[PDB]
Design a protein around this nucleic acid. Structure first.
Ligand SMILES: [Mg+2]
Ligand SMILES: [Mg+2]
Ligand SMILES: [Mg+2]
Length: 430
DNA sequence: ATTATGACGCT
DNA sequence: AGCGTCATG
């Protein structure tokens, strides 16, 4: 009753750039704008692998993981932009630099946690407090929320998309208790006002459109963000959770899309997130461990405590390349040449990172995959990273992996390597 | 023959 | 430390 916490203490948003690599290419090349298009890596094998798809192309069934030659069968007019190649491998610098552009704008409004190259969480609790003091009990006009959806509304006693959106927003704003500075629904609404402003600033200063979710925690914010894409934002209130979760497949919740979510479904004999409420916390802990069990018990009630970490920069800087099928590396010269290519890209990125961000990596991690192993990584070994020098890094990586060579011959490498990966980690201020 | 990443948990 | 899992531009 009066002591049951409801997880309404924070306002958290998740901002995700719409089809991000596609938008970067469309900004650069206006001929791609408002077209079915996709971004591909490489070209020789089946036209290259698609990694990002504009919403126009998605309407034809084009998806990530498609080969471009297959996507062209669904969408013959599909336009393609290729990722840059440097030192024989894909180079994603253009997109990393664009991400920094966006993250720096977001950081003007609040502390952010970089979750990926194109998404960031925002803790808006204090900004909402501020804006509420400024508003002086003034109601919130729908004009301040021109792209906001209220999940679960309209409900109760027009046939266009935007008309629906506005009816739901009107129902929400009519029920609002604006004289209560501690109303969670009011704080979420002010949070959405701020996120509209943030999204306006991103689009004005970069050209890029994004979607966003606003709720009381990171999991609900991420889920909300996905509800209305693209170029829209969604508010998921605590009250909306029972109906939302009542038909929500467990796999749609971040961290439950893989084996653990499959075991929740199998062991408990349920399908939807809301069904989890019928188990005790001890029951869930017994099946899924203390940590997961407690997390599931709270999360199916809309409650989650994971903080927005103040981290705008990646924790690791890595370079990797697959060598599939026939291209697997089978000679020592081959392995050394590619280790050097990877190390040269890594040195370039590390030197720029040291200049930009006043930090130095201290550990080099070397990972390989060998032909036939089903695991993505077959071997992972770390060594000291003492100098940003590509020849030294590649020699060290070769030293830490050299005893993987089964070959009785010094020159041959067996069994051949299908993946090389170098990662710089454990940064210290400098 | 997706591929190139990146974060975090377990032991 | 090294491995697994999860995410997916
Ligand atoms: Mg995105
Ligand atoms: Mg994203
Ligand atoms: Mg995606």
């Amino acid at each position: 009753g009066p002591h049951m916490a409801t997880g309404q203490d924070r306002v958290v948003a998740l901002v995700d750039m719409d089809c991000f690599f596609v938008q970067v290419e469309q900004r650069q090349n206006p001929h791609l704008r408002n077209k079915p298009c996709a971004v591909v890596q490489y070209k020789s094998w089946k036209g290259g692998g698609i990694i990002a798809v504009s919403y126009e192309a998605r309407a034809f069934g084009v998806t990530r993981s498609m080969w471009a030659d297959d996507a062209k069968k669904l969408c013959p007019d599909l336009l393609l932009a290729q990722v840059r190649e440097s030192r024989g491998k894909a180079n994603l610098t253009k997109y990393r630099e664009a991400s920094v552009e966006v993250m720096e704008i977001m950081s003007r409004f609040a502390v952010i946690e970089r979750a990926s190259i194109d998404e960031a969480y925002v803790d808006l609790t204090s900004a909402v407090q501020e804006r509420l003091q400024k508003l002086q009990g003034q109601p919130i006009s729908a004009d301040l929320l021109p792209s906001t959806y209220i999940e679960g509304l309209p409900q109760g006693p027009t046939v266009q998309k935007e008309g629906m959106r506005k009816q739901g927003l009107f129902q929400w704003l009519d029920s609002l208790q604006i004289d209560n500075l501690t109303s969670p629904d009011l704080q979420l609404t002010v949070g959405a006002v701020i996120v509209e402003e943030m999204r306006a600033a991103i689009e004005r200063e970069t050209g890029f459109q994004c979607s966003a979710g606003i709720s009381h925690n990171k999991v609900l914010a991420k889920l909300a963000c996905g509800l209305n894409k693209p170029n829209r934002q969604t508010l998921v209130s605590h009250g909306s959770v029972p109906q939302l979760f009542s038909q929500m497949p467990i796999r749609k919740i971040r961290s439950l899309g893989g084996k653990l979510g499959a075991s929740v479904i199998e062991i408990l004999g349920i399908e939807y997130m809301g069904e989890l409420t019928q188990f005790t916390e001890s029951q869930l802990q017994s099946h899924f461990g203390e940590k997961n069990g407690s997390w599931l018990y709270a999360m199916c009630r809309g409650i989650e405590h994971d903080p927005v970490k103040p981290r705008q920069l990646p924790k690791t800087i890595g370079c990797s390349k697959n060598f599939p099928g026939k291209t697997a590396l089978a000679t020592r010269e081959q392995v050394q040449w590619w280790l050097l290519q990877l190390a040269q890209e890594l040195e370039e990125r590390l030197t720029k990172d040291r200049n930009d961000n006043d930090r130095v990596a201290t550990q080099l991690v070397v990972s390989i995959r060998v032909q036939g192993d089903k695991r993505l990584s077959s071997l992972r070994r770390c060594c000291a990273l003492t100098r940003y020098d590509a020849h030294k890094m590649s020699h060290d990586a070769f030293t830490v992996i050299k005893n993987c060579n089964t070959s009785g011959i010094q020159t041959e490498w067996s069994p051949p390597l299908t993946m090389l990966f170098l990662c710089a980690t454990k940064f210290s201020a400098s």
